Amino acid sequence: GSHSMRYFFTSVSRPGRGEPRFIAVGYVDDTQFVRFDSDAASQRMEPRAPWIEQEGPEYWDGETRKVKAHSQTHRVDLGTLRGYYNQSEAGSHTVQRMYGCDVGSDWRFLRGYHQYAYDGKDYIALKEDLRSWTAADMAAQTTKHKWEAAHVAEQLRAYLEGTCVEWLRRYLENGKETLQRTDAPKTHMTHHAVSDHEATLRCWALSFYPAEITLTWQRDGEDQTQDTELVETRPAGDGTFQKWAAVVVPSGQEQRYTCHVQHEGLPKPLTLRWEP
């Protein structure tokens, strides 16, 4: 199917002492493959997937230099934003940035993105055209005018349509054994009495990859949302994901209810029904 490469950066200021805490993580689809944490001992970009460990010393030197340059940009930005928003040096503030590219089934460029937030709110983002900026407020409008004069969107578009997708395709090839393998959900249903006349049916989807999934309950072949609970998709901790959906039903009526599972690793959606 379609694939993506995405980098996430967070910097948090430390008003009491020192410089910001900086954390950067890189992903291919839902697989973390690199990380940098300013609080860690190495002070290097570190591998988190076996297929990236293949890369030579010049790759690791280059990624370490670039990620420390991103850390310095965020540190300077934290100071700039304090002034733009007329804030004191006393509070802790946060800057977040995410950028990356998507490729279609044919591994050709589909879309690029580059966005930035200050204190958890949109600040400035590159539009879908990769030519224009969306500034959320007047402080960001000042940044937009500066970047419109410094060829910033041009440089970002060249990276997103070129380097980003070329390296994504290299990673997809090198890590083929895991990155191009789909792990269909292992599904089962559990039953938990809630009284002597009602029970919860819980439909589980375990150990699946990628994280995108749909779990839906039906009653007598029509969608049911009343008395249902769906948890947010959560990491198993081993690189796969989990989810469940539950419904409270009258005891003895379990056969009317079906759980429907849709996932990229399944040729056709799965249907589960409680079997006593």
Partner: peptide, 9 residues
């Protein structure tokens, strides 16, 4: 592979 553009706000 990270971008090499490091432009400040």
């Amino acid at each position: 592979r990270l971008n090499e553009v490091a432009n400040n706000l």
